[PDB]
Each structure stands twice: as C-alpha cells, then as structure tokens.
Symmetry: D2
Subunit: 455 residues, 4 copies
C-alpha cells in the first residue's frame, strides 16, 4: 500500500472525470482544503505542505524508474534528458542517453533532468492527465535528480506556476517574494541571479520525501544539497500564458474589426493634419487638437468592450487547450463501457462479435468530461477532442470531426449533461437516423460510452 | 493661358509648400471654400461644382497626351492600361496581354471599350505635380486614374469604392449618377463593393451631365455610375485619397501595443484566468444564467477600458507618418527651390573637364528644409532616423523606405530644422555642441536634397 | 514453441559475424535453392516459386493475432499505417475512416469485404524488424515490408507491377497468384509503379499458383501480378521489398553532374566556347537539317560525353550511396553476445540509492572490433571525415536525421582498419595511431556510441 | 559625321538583321577580317587594332552623355554607377541617387566612375549592343569607365567573359598577359587581384588612343594605368558569359541519363549487392578485380549516354535563355514603316483616325527581324519566345512567349526559316484560311511580323 496507490484505486471508482480531477488535487495538497488554497494562496503565496509521510508519493516516479527508462526506452540527450553541473555548464553529449553515459555524468557531479516523464511513465501520465482537467491549463512535469554534495543552480524565477513534490532524499529550498512590482506574476523567465541580487527568503526548508512546495511565477527560488544524500523531485508546471492579458491579446484585433464593420464612428477618416501635433516630436505641445485627439482615442478604446467577441475567443482557447492536453486515462468501467473494451477481436482465423450496434434504446454519455469541445469556425461546427493526442506535447496536429446542423443540439446536449445517461432516442434531432448517426460517430471515435456494453 | 496654367505659375511663386498645397486645393474646388467643404461635405455629401469654364483644366491631361504616351512609353495592358466595356448590365475585360500599342488601344476604343490609365502620374509631369502638391494637404496618398470612354457607351457597372473620389471632367461629357450609402454599414465603406445591378439601387442623390471644367466629389460608400450620351466621348481624371485612413485603422495599430504595455506595467493584466471559465464562456454557453459569466464579461470591459492609459498614440502617429512618406510622390520643386538646392548646382562637365566644382556650406550659410512635407523623424529601438521622400519613384512603392540615421548630437538641430520651416536659420546658430556637428548635419541634409540655402552656393 | 523460423533465429544468435548471419538468413528464406544460383540466374530476371511443403516454416514471424494486438495496444492510424481497400468487379475502393484504426473498426471493415494492409509492420513487430534488419545487410539496399490480410471470397488489389523486387511470404490461408513477364521492353525492370490494369490488356501468366503457408513467391520489378482469395479461406502474407532506385542509371545520375564540373575545371576542351551560330542548325526545327555543322556538333557532343568517364568521382559517389543506405537502415539487432560485450550490456545500474559497477574503462590491452559489419561508414565531405552510423536509427523510416561523428586525420587510419578488419579483434595499443591518447580516445568514443565491442566485458 | 554615324546610317539600309549584325562587327574590328579573327584570334589571342582615327567612335558615347544622364535620368549609386579608387579597390558610393554634384565631386577627388548599364540610357549604345548580340549568339553587355587624370589604376586580374575595349576619350596604357597556368586558360570564374610580382612580361602592351580597339579572351590578365596627365573614357563590350561546351553538357547529361534509363534496360539493372565492399574512398587501393570491372562498366555506360543526349531540346533551351537575355531590337526606318509600330492610327480632333486595315490572304509577310523569336517545345506544347517586349534593363521583364497551336506549327517554322523572303499569307502551310490569317494577324499584332507594303 501507499497513499498514492490508494487515491488511484479511489479515482478508478469515481464515475465523474470532473470529480476525480478535484479529488486528485485535494490529495496533492492534503490536508489543506483546495478552496482555501485557490482563494488565498494560488498566485499569491509560496506554500509548504509538511507531509510527515515519506511514503506519500511512492509509486509516482523513482530513480529506479529513470534507470529502467534509460535502458528500455529511446531517451535522447537534449530532447529528453539534460545533464548539468554548476556558472551553469551543460554536459550533453549528443545522442542516446544510455545508463552508462548518464550514470557516469551523475558520478561526476552532474544533475539529471528528465524533460518529459509522462511520455515514459504511465503513472506520471495519469497524474498530469487528471490534474490538467481542474487547472483548465496544460500541466507539464520535469523530474530532477541531484547527486550528493553538488552545487545548486543559480537563483531564478519562472513564468509558470510550480509545485515541487519531493520524491527521494532531501533538499534545502529557499523561495523569495517577487522583489519589485514588475516581477509579480512575471511574464517571462528571469536571468540567473547573484546572491547579492536577493533579499531574505519568505520560505526556507529542507524538503523531505512526501513534502510539497508551491510558488507562483515570479517567485525566485534556489535549492541546495543536504546531509550528504541525493535528491529526486518531480516538478509540476501549469498556467503558461493563461493570463487576462493573453485573453485580451486575442480579443482586441477582433473587437476593432467588429467595431469598424458595425459602427460608422470607427470608419471616420483621421484628421488631415494630425501629423502636425501627434508624434514624439510633439510630446509636450500645448496644442488643444492634441488633447482632443487623445480623448477620442480613449473614448473609442473604451467603447471597444461592447464589441469584444468573448465567447468566440473562449472557444479558441478551449481548442488550444484540447490540442495541448494529454490523452485521457480511462477507468476500468469507462474502458469496459466504450469502443475500447468492446470484445471485437480476431479469434481462430476470424473476427468475433462484429455487428454490435447502438439502437434508440442504448443509454449514452460522453466518455469523460474534458475530452471534447464544440467550436464554430467560418460557418461550420467542429468537435475537437483529445482522445487521439500523443503523450508527447504537440506530437499530433489538432483533431476534430464535423458536426452537422441537424445534430448540433444533440451534441451540446451530450456535452452539457455529463455524466447523466440519455437515451439515443431522446436526443433532440429531427430524425431517428440523425440520433443513431451522431451516437455511432461519437462512440466509434471513442468519445462516448454506453450504460451497458453493446450486444 | 488656362486657369490650370495660371495657378501652377502662381504656385511657382509661393515660397511655402504647405501654403501652396492649400492654394491648389482651394483652386481645385473653386468657388467653394475649403473650410466649408471640410467641415460639412467631406466624408458626408456628394458635391457638384459647376465650373462655368470649359477651359479650367486645360493642360493637366488630354487624349492627345494619352495617345503619345501609348506610342512613346512602355505602356502595358493590365499593369498600366485597362480596356473594359459594360454591355447590357455585364462587365467584361478585354486586355490583350503585353504592350499596349496605339493600334491595339485605338482599335479597342472603336469596338466600344473604355480605356483606363492606372498611373497617369508616372507618364505626365503635370498630373505628378498636381498629386504631389495635393497629397501634402490630405496627409494621405493621392492617386489618380484616367478614364477614356467612347461615344454611346458605359465602361463600368455601378459600384462604390473605398476611397474619397474627386472626378475632374476633362473632355466631352458624361451623365453621372451618384447614390447615398443605401444602408448604415455601407456608409464610409471599408472595402470596394461588388458590381451591382440597377435593381439594387434606389434614386440617385445626384444626377448630372458633367462638362469640361466640372468637379464631382463623393465619399467612399457612395455608389456611382456614368454614361456617355449625345454622340460625344468623355475623358476624366479621378483623384483618390484616404485609403484606410480611419480612426479604426489607428486603433488597429495601437491596441496590440497597448495590451503588451498594460501587461508589462500592471499586474491586473498578468493575473491568471479562472481555472474553469470554459464551463460558462464559449458559444455553447451564451444562454447561461451563470453569474460567473456576468462577472467575466465585466472584467473584460473594465480591462479593455483601461487600455486607453497604455495606448502609445505618438509612436503609432510616427509609424503612420513613415508609411505616408513611403507612399508619397516625390516633391515638385519650384524654380527657386531648384536654384537654391543641390539640384540646381552648376557643377557640370564642359570641354573635357568638370567646371564650377567650388562651393561648400559654412557656419555663415543660411538654411531651411527644402519643403515641408518631404521628411519625418522617427525613433526606432534606441536609434533615430529621418525618413524622406525625395528619392521616391512616381510609381507607387517601386522604391523601398529611404532614410538616414540621425545621431544624438544632431537630434535637436534636426527637430529645429523640421519645426521652423520655412524660416532660414544660420548653420552656426544650429543647436549642436560642435562646429563640426552643425556643419556635418547641414552637408548631409543638403547633399541628400533635403535642404536649401538662402543664396546659391 | 519450435518452428524452422525460431530454429534459424536461434542459430543466428550463435553466428559471431553479422555478414555471415545475413547470408545465412537469406539462405533460409529461399531454402533449398542456393543463393548463388538465385542471384546469378533468377534475381532481376525470373519469377520464382518456392513450394515449401511446410506450413510451419514462418511461424513466429507475424500473424493475424499479432495484428489484432498491435491495433489494440499501439497507435495505428488509418492512411499512415493501415489501409482498408476492396477490389470489386475491376475497380479500386479505399475505405479508410480518418484517425485511429481500432480493432472494432478494422474487423468490421474486414467482415464487410475489405483487405487490410499494414505499411510498416517492422515499427510494431520485433521479429519483422529483426528479419528485415539482417536481410538489409546482404541486399546492400533497404528492406521494407507490408503485411496483407484478405477476407474469404475476395481480391484486395487490381493487377499492376511495382518498382521494387518482391518476396512474398505466405503466412496464413491460401491465395491464387498470377504473375506475368514484362509485357514490353520498356516495362522490363521498370522504374516506376504501373497504373492499375484491366485483365484485357494482360497476356498469359508465366507463373500461376495457389500459395500455401510457408511458400515464397519472388518476382522482379516490372512483372505484373494479381492475387485471388478462394475456397472460403482468408489470406495473410508479408511482402519483403528491396532495390528501390538502386540502379546503374541512379548511380550515373549522381556521378555525371560532378564529372562535367570536374572536366570543366581540369580540361580546357570543356571550357571552349560554343559556336556563335549553333542555334541556326541545332534545335527541334532543324532535326532534318543537312548542314554538316549539325553533324560535327553532334559528333562533338558524343566525343566529349565519352571523355567524362575519366572524370567520374566513382568512389565519392559510392560513399554518398552508403551514407544514404546507413540513413535508410533499420537499427541493428544485437546477439546475446554482442549486447554483453558492448556499452549496452555493462552492468551499471541504480541500486539502493546509488549507481553500482561505475567506471571500468578501456586500456591499451583491451581487444576490440566493430559491433557489427553493417552499422557504420566513413565518409569524407568538404575536406572533413565523418562516421555515419545506424545504431540510433528508428524502426520508422527516416524518422531520425542522418547521424554521424567526426573523425580527425590523426584517427582516420585506425578507423579504416576497424571497418576493414571485422570481426578480427585488434588490441587498442595496436591501432595505427600517432599517440597513445589518440588510440584510447578513438576506442572510447566508438565504444561509448555503441559502435564497438570488447573481447571480454569491461 | 564620323565613321560610327556612317556605319549606323548604312545599317538603316541593310534589309537583313543578320547581315547588319555581320556588317557592324566587321566595322568594329576594321581593318581586321572577321573570318581571320574568329578562326584564329577569338578565344586564343589578345588583339590590338590601332585605328588611326580619333573620330572612329564619335556618336557612341561621351563624357558629355554621362553628364546629361546624371541630370536627366534617375541614376543610382551601386545599381547604375560605381565610384572607386585604388590596395585594394575602395568603393566610395554614397547610397542612393547619383546627382551631378555628387558624381563630379567624387571624380575630382580622384575616383573613377563606372556606369554599369549604359544601354539603358543611351540609345546608340543600345543599338550597338542589340545588333552585336545577333552575331555572337550570346548576350552583349557593356560598361563605361571614366578615369580622372593621374589616378592609380586597378589591380591586375582576369575575367570570365570575352572583352573588347573601345577607347573613347583620352589615353590609357594597357598591359595584357597570356593565362599563366593551364587552369587559367579560358577561366570559368573571375580571378582575385594579383600583384606585379605574380606576373611576367605582357604579351601585349600599348597606349590606347580614341578610336583604338583592344580584345582579349577570358583568362587573360589585364591592367591599365593613367597616361599623359589626361583623363580617360572607354567602353567595354562583354559576351560569352557561361557559353561553353561544358555548360551545354551540364544541361544535356541529367536528361541523357534519364532518357537512357527509360529507353535501355542496361541502365535499369540493379547495382551489385556488395559494391560498397570495394568501392568508396576506403577502397581506392583495393586489389579486388570487382573494382576494375565496376569502373569499366561506368565508363562503358557513360560512353553510351551520348546516343541518348537531347541535343536539340537543350539547344532550344539555351535559345530561349538567349531570347530572355537579349536587348529589344532596334528597327530600321523601313522595318518600322512596314509593321504594327508604324501604323498611322492616331487620335486627332476627338477621334481615332486611320483605323484598322486588315491582313488578307494577299498580304505578303516575313518576320520583323531574324533574331527576335524562337519556337520552343515545352510539355507537349509549342511556344514562340520573343524579344520585342524585353527591357533595355537586363531581366527587368520575365520570358515572353505566345502559344502556337499544332495547326499553325508548319507555317511558323516556315516563317522563321525563310527570313527575309516575303510570303503570301494564303501560301502559309495551314489546313484552313482562318488558321493562315489567324497566325499572321497574331504575329503582326505582337510586333513580330512585317508586311511587304504598309496596311
Ligand atoms: Fe525554476
Ligand atoms: Fe468607381
Ligand atoms: Fe504489387
Ligand atoms: Fe577586367
């Protein structure tokens, strides 16, 4: 047993994918309640959870897992594994990362960074796939392996929300509040800093297996070796470029374009002579045409809010989130009740069970709650889905299927009413054949499950 | 001496380019006062000026000019010249590919084809001057086309355009119909229309036979249509401006910069979105009762409103001035601007040798910008550049943007030169530190053709 | 369980040389026919049938059950990995839904009449990979495969010819094949695949036969073939294909532009000006001209073209082909013993919070040979020397870029000896190098890359 | 008048464009016979023609012409005009427009002036080059060089084109040298600059006077220096850029291999399975006799390639490239009078007059000139490429062709092959009258054809 294997068996038994995302996150920070965490701590404060349980994460990832993937899997330096010694010197021999070369670099003082553990570990995959569903943002991970008595990286801050889960050994972390207003919730990663750049840490602790450390983007952090032992931790990262400003970036051009098409005031010609009083050379001119020009800009910018296509941009963001998502991890029930667990197979020179079909009696809901998004584009409707994504980020292009207007209302019904079962024959389409057709298309793609297995 | 010829001779005597762009525009719409035209009619009303003077434009452009350019210049179908006819409500284009010889052009004319010259300012020094001075009081590029229509025919279907149009009737006559924007969306239209049918149109707001000397103006979005009757041909020149010179176009450039500035400088724009906003935002949720939607939409409007504060208005103005400089026709110099500038220097080869090689600028030399609408200072990434117009081609965008770096020690003297046209300043009185820097700026600008001197060097 | 295939695979594991095991595996492929006879008389010349009289011959290579398992456990895609098609009354249909090919979809297609073809079984099957990887080594050319599964009472494909050499291994069920001599001189050893033909424009088959599990059918590029499933049984075969664009012409296509350039640089006759007026008697409008200057001109073309042979960089072009071949190659399959004697097998592992068995290096006394004989090639380009290798290639064709490492002139002569002396062990101290550091660094480099094994495990 | 104005007046009355190209080249090198020149000197020997007539080129180009073009045309530094002094060569080009004030001031400071495209701005240089290209079979370019008094001359070097220097004004001491090694004979590329130590005795040393001509093959080193304290002006005519037996072959051989592969099975046979065992740089000293056989076979096959060479198609491609490189033709008074360009159609008093006489079957025709068009087979169709819309600026225009339909091919071939014989349109080898008139009219309208009497 282990608290991790225990929460996973529980996850396997929770019917809603939405609820199992909430449960897993609750586990991640236990005993702190998530509502308190998100309202008071998320994006505001560094958080230490002292677990008092070295066993908490057992089974998530281990140095033994890393050793195994080095030999059994096609781990490449640069692409998958960084080896670094500390200024920062990257000792990446080009090519395959063999145990021989990796472990040799480690004995010589290099830290090992696995860039994509979810690509090679079914457990990390499941972990990130369920968690992405309650962030609404891609969730990545790196695993870090630090040898005994090695110098630590320079202090710096990142552009993502970080959760560090201490897996093996011990490490002394120092984290710092943003040092100036500009660095609070920073837009981009920092350069490396000198000790003399830093204030006092807001948080300093020796992390032990099972512990958790969270800090927002813009919080400087630094870590060093302890007690003559090694260190392994997994870092979980989210909220890359998931800002009110990023939403605004997409909204604005569309809003100006809408205001122009729909309001004459936006289509009126500039003054013939605004170049006489606007421009850097005129920055302290006391010309009242300049004051009037400025006001008119502010008035029009302000009115643009009425023209903001918020819903269409929400949908484009949802489309990109689908494209960024890890593919889903099916429960045993979900598998059994879907195309994936359907007993059609080759058996003694022939297939068996071919012909199993949906009927109007079949009861139906989406496989999971975070696998699909209906998006209207250039007059047409497309259901984008995650079920064919690779465990490698953007390895695949975005996948969709066209949803026809006769079946649009049924689709929104399915998306809106998970995990409630609905009869195929109760789907709001104009025809029986449109009901079956939508149901079959979705089931075949792996987007749907049936209340009982087919035939 | 035609009125066109008198105003040009008059222009030659006006020292300020700013003042002569005003004077030509005044002449163009005479007797209507420009102040009245601009406050009430510009972008609002179709406008007819009945000149009462068949000679008003004599010398600007004529069918003979067209004829000789066809035989003496490399005039190409498609690129330079269109042949078109609009028979029975249907538009057709009859450009045989390649060079447009008189033989081919005049034969298409006899077959009922209108001929349209796309860039008369490339082939005519007077259309060039005309546009080059007018562009200076529009603050916007001024283009033109010439239309030659054979008797008893129409070249073009009814449509509206995306520019401000002034038609000058040059020869013969033509019956024009111009229509109010037919719906609020077509008012000051953003793009040119498709060809319409008669069925699409209401009653013209203006219907008139144009005669030589007459002017017709109408805003973008006004549908128009023109017809040769009696038994006479027509020739007109259409002057176009204000392409994409809209407040919206200004906003289009300003907003991405504003958002970026807002994000660098104010944490509210850097806060994370909600983890669950996709549950209540998006097309499938427009019906939603969910109070979180109302809050979300409010936040959008608040933040959008705050962008005003972050809008780099002066920088985008400077960027649009750069583009305008890139768009401009090169200047037409008056006799005395020539005589006083590098252009009218007597240095020449004569009898096996260069003569009159002796002249340089001194601290005593008095100096101002060659003209007032030929150059613009712009700050690009910690550097300073003077963009100018004097080497632009008469052909639109043939030349790439032209500039020269102005160094920090020269910046204030440059701003002064620009800000004080047409006031002569002594080179030695120039606000630099060094005698060297004062003289260096002056020689650079002079040699480049941006600067004139009080007396010939 | 035992099968002739499993038996030969075990035999291969005991042959030290990779060259000898490629020879042995190909010998098994066509047994009892001797290879020498096959290559001298049949290869590129005649369709060949091997009646095996042994339904178990291939057992262990690939099966429909294997295909089922790869469809369910692997991300097999329609179009890119798998085609579903039916050849009906003479005309081709292609029924690929887009996206993932699940067992549910694949088998429904199969029951509705569709043949299935898997385009790169070697990506998903370890045994097909090994089979192909050793075979490539004695073809000197990439060996690919497809797997074809045909439902009872059906044909998958119209009659056509191909642009590769085909060995068809009948794996399950039976199939009636017809193969035809090239119909016209132009189609012999054809350069491109034909369009689909009608039965009407074919002659008489040169070979017509029901294939049975264990049989092999070989025929050259340009031979039309057609295959019918009968008697309510299905068919499964794997087609092995090689010799794509591996032609004397292809070699010439690369040698000639280089030779003209060399001729121009080195010989003034190729730098002399053309006649000022050759366009008066040369060109399509002059094909019937009686001008003698036309005759002189064409004689001159012929004379100069013939001289180009003396200027042909034949070796540099051979090396560019070996490079491309290294790039097309499947990664190698190591024998138990090769693993044990290479970087891949040293006992460095993570045990109880630390690495164990770390550091056992190479001495001047350690004995050494190339890991296998068809995994690297030394290529000089632009005044530098590179060792292109195979061991980091993926089993997906061209998924990875060409991989190399630089060899410095101080190491060149030793590299040649290692490439040239396989599988004879050479002591590191014997490597023909200036220094002793140069002997160790080279040896260490190759070993660390997986290009070299040691007589005794380090 | 002058010898140049005389030969130009003469050209005006020679009816054949071919015969005028020949006549002008005779003039260029008079009293040297063209036959002797091409037979024994061209590409073999430096040639001096001491003319004894300072007046010989008067009318071609002058410094006074340079001066008006600096004022009346939009001449640009870099693009049209270089100013340099010599090392090495120091370029003193200001960027942008080359005004009289800037060019003359650079000259007076000791810079030489090089005009790159005189044919673009001089009508008589245009004619000179346009007629001369027609008997070279190769683009004829020119530059004009103005050298101030007492200026240090350029470094010795050789070029990759055939050069004729025409001394226009003043005087210049030229030294020219035989190619110094086999590899420099008829060199493929221009050399770097040499030092005086690298050279020996000039094969040709002379002070050029106005009217003189100096010719030397590509590969001959040359240098010039100031004389007698006077300025110098000369025009250099260049041709035969990349017009070599090797350049022809370069185009022939890829297509020959391709054809041999399509047409003969020997080229379609597989390489040996193990050639890599004895071919390649590792094996240059292999004793294996399989290497000997492999070699012989390459030579044997390379030798058969000559039977497959599409000589004619490559001829036509080089001809199409020459058509594209060519200057537009200069029409005689008669050629203009008898063609579309000479039709009297004009605007007079509000109307076109003299409009549209038509070609009939009775009209006698021939091609406008002999080197203005080429009939080329491309992708199963026929195109007539032509020169008459080319710019006086090199490649300013793309290739111009008109499609010629199979029904009109014989008649087009006849017209191209019978210049300057007149033929009745009715006697054109077409199956119908429409096709005869259709072709003639098409050619006439493009400016490709003249009529025996004006229409
Ligand atoms: Fe960090
Ligand atoms: Fe219009
Ligand atoms: Fe086939
Ligand atoms: Fe030279």
């Amino acid at each position: 047993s282990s608290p991790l294997r225990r929460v996973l068996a529980e996850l396997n038994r929770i019917p809603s994918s939405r609820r199992r995302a909430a449960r897993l996150f609750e586990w991640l920070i236990a005993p702190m309640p998530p509502d308190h965490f998100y309202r008071r701590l998320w994006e505001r404060e560094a958080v230490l959870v002292r677990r008092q349980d070295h066993t908490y994460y057992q089974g998530l990832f281990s140095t033994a897992d890393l050793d195994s993937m080095l030999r059994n899997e096609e781990v490449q330096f640069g692409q998958h594994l960084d080896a670094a010694r500390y200024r920062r010197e990257t000792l990446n021999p080009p090519g395959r990362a063999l145990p021989a070369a990796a472990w040799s670099l480690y004995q010589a003082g290099c830290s090992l960074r696995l860039l994509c553990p979810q690509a090679f570990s079914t457990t990390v995959w499941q972990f990130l796939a369920v968690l992405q569903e309650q962030f609404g943002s891609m969730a990545g991970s790196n695993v870090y392996l630090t040898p005994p008595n090695s110098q630590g990286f320079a202090p710096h801050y990142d552009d993502i929300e970080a959760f560090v889960l201490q897996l093996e050994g011990r490490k002394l972390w120092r984290v710092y509040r943003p040092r100036a207003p500009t660095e609070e919730l920073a837009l981009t990663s920092s350069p490396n800093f000198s000790q003399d750049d830093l204030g006092e840490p807001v948080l300093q602790t020796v992390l032990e297996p099972g512990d958790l450390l969270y800090f927002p983007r813009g919080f400087i952090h630094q870590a060093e070796c302890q007690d003559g032992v090694h260190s392994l931790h997994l870092t979980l990262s989210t909220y890359q470029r998931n800002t009110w400003g990023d939403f605004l970036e997409a909204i604005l051009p569309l809003a100006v374009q809408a205001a122009m098409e729909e309001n004459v005031e936006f289509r009126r010609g500039l003054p013939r002579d605004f170049m006489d009083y606007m421009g850097a050379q005129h920055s302290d001119s006391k010309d009242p045409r300049r004051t009037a020009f400025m006001e008119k800009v502010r008035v029009l910018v302000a009115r643009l809010g009425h023209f903001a296509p918020v819903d269409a941009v929400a949908d484009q963001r949802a489309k990109d989130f689908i494209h960024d998502s890890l593919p889903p991890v099916l429960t045993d029930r979900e598998r059994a009740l879907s195309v994936y667990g359907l007993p059609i197979r080759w058996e003694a020179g022939e297939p068996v069970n071919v012909g199993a079909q949906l009927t109007t009696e079949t009861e139906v809901h989406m496989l999971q709650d975070g696998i699909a998004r209906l998006v209207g584009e250039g007059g047409h409707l497309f259901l984008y889905y995650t079920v064919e994504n690779s465990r490698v980020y953007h390895l695949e292009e975005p996948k969709c299927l066209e949803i026809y207007p006769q079946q649009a209302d049924a689709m929104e019904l399915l998306l809106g009413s998970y995990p409630e079962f609905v009869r195929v024959g109760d789907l709001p389409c104009d025809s029986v054949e449109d009901q079956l057709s939508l149901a079959t298309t979705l089931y075949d793609k792996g987007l749907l499950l049936t209340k009982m297995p087919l035939a």
